[PDB]
């Protein structure tokens, strides 16, 4: 049971630019939080949706092999995962992602929320923060 409660922008991209492309990889996440960082977007920065069916986009649903998932389209490649994946997933690309960042998304662990790395193109735009809630 965990929400997305906050994300930041890897340098060189704005926190609202993280939470679209936030979105977008999020959109065919079948996982609990996958609803969560949707709507994380929409009420912090920019009630905004996907626009793969204007564009003729592909979704990519999450698998467990990568622990991640994410979408790509004619114009845009953005991707969703756990820090360790996306991660991998830059270097892969032959990109990189920001340390002040990757600092954050360790902060985001440390405290026990579960820091999703989203990228655009082979670098990382933002840390998707999830925080667990509590009910009794």
């Given at each position: 049971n965990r929400q997305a409660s906050e994300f930041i922008p890897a340098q060189g991209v704005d926190e609202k630019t993280l939470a679209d492309a936030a979105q977008l990889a999020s959109l065919?996440?079948?996982?609990?939080e996958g609803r969560s960082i949707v709507i994380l977007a929409k009420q912090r920065f920019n009630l905004r949706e996907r626009d793969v069916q204007s564009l003729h986009a592909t979704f990519v649903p999450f698998t467990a092999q990568s622990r991640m998932s994410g979408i790509n389209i004619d114009n845009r490649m953005i991707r969703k995962g756990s820090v360790d994946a996306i991660r991998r997933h830059v270097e892969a690309n032959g990109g990189h992602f920001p340390t002040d960042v990757d600092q954050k998304v360790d902060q985001v662990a440390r405290q026990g929320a579960t820091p999703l790395v989203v990228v655009e193109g082979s670098r990382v735009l933002g840390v998707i923060a999830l925080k667990d809630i509590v009910k009794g």
């Open positions: 065919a996440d079948e996982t609990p």
